[PDB]
């Protein structure tokens, strides 16, 4: 109905493949190389998607970049959670059509804890009967859920925008009041997962030269420059609940 929902549908990215060799047996390096490549590819799509979001151009440019860089892992996790829900009912993790994790890959990548958390996130889509329209509006608000402790270059514009995305999530929800509690809670839970993924990726970047994992240039850069701001506590997420 709203103009709003039309937009999110219209701009929602399409299928992104990882380019993985599914004929080669699994190794840590191969799996982790194909996730890194996938990361880069999905980053490109998140950037394009973000810039077409309504009111996004209102932000100062450096806020535009910052916000995407900080929130990217979360958004990925979230959409990946859904992709897994819709495509295979959360029995496995649908990173991409050519990169679907089963438990064995969960263990081999050495991200079993983090993957486990994400499968549970996928299950929540099912348990809560999340609709495609709640998913899209939730995802758009994720982009506005993580900011530097010392705020942005133009905090006001950000706050306005975030406020209006909350409102719009409220419109498409509607004792229904309790729906909001749940979704806000489900949104809150994305952050600790992205944080665990941030640490893993960081640590991995740091040993990459020595485990034969290849990092695309834009990854290495984000993971080394922006991510450590999150892990050091300069950049914190916005939680609905305490």
């Amino acid at each position: 109905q709203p103009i709003f929902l039309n937009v999110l549908e219209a701009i929602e990215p399409g299928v992104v493949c990882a380019g993985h060799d599914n004929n080669q047996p699994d190794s840590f390096a191969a799996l982790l190389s194909s996730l890194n490549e996938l990361g880069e590819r999905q980053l490109v799509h998140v950037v394009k998607w973000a810039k077409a979001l309504p009111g996004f151009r209102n932000l100062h440019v450096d806020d535009q970049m910052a916000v995407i860089q900080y929130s990217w892992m979360g958004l990925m996790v979230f959409a990946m959670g859904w992709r897994s829900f819709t495509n295979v009912n959360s029995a496995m993790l649908y990173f991409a059509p050519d990169l679907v994790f089963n438990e064995y890959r969960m263990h081999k990548s050495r991200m079993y804890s983090q993957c486990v958390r994400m499968r549970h996130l996928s299950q929540e889509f099912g348990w809560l009967q999340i609709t495609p329209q709640e998913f899209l509006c939730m995802k758009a608000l994720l982009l506005f859920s993580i900011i530097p402790v010392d705020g942005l270059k133009n905090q006001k514009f950000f706050d306005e925008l975030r406020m209006n995305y909350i409102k719009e999530l409220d419109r498409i929800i509607a004792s229904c009041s309790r729906r909001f509690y749940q979704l806000t809670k489900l949104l809150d839970s994305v952050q600790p997962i992205a944080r665990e993924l941030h640490q893993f990726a960081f640590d991995l970047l740091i040993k990459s030269h020595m485990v034969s994992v290849d990092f695309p240039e834009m990854m290495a850069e984000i993971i080394s420059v922006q991510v450590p701001k999150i892990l050091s506590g300069k950049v914190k997420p916005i939680y609905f609940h305490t």
Binding site: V47, Q64, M65, Q69, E217, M218, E221, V225
Partner: peptide, 7 residues
């Protein structure tokens, strides 16, 4: 940067 050099 490699992000602001492609934005």
């Amino acid at each position: 940067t490699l992000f602001s050099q492609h934005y």
